[PDB]
């Protein structure tokens, strides 16, 4: 119960996207492709750095685009 969980990772991603695009985190759709959320390439760089600070994982292009939705990405980062 101590480790970072998938619900926690999902929430953190919704918060991040919500702040980047100016929307309530609860309104961020976890099933759409993250390239359709209104994130910029600059956002991707910043989010990748923030994920590495949160989890110690350096996210590869391969992993991210093979898990291209918030819910699938969160599941793969943790799991
Ligand atoms: Ca923005
Ligand atoms: Ca707004
Ligand atoms: Ca859904
Ligand atoms: Ca660092
Ligand atoms: Ca791994």
Distance CA 59, CA 48 (A): 7
Centre of ligand 2 from the C-alpha of residue 24, in Å:
8
Structural domain for 73, as ranges: 1-79
The total of structural domains in the chain comes to: 1
Query: At how many Å resolution was this determined?
Result: 1.6
Chain-centroid distance of CA 52 in Å reads 11
Tell which phi-psi region holds residue 13, choosing left (phi > 0), alpha (psi between -120 and 50) or beta: alpha
Distance 34 CA to ligand 3 centre (A): 13
User: How far does Cα 44 stand from its chain's mean position?
Assistant: 9
Ligand nearest to the CA of 25: 2
């Amino acid at each position: 119960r101590a480790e970072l969980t998938v619900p926690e990772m999902r929430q953190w991603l919704r918060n991040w996207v919500g702040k980047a695009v100016g929307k309530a985190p609860d309104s961020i759709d976890e099933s759409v492709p993250m390239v359709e959320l209104g994130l910029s390439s600059r956002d991707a760089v910043a989010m990748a750095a923030d994920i590495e600070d949160l989890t110690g994982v350096t996210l590869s292009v391969a992993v991210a685009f093979a898990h291209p939705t918030i819910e699938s990405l969160a599941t793969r980062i943790i799991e």
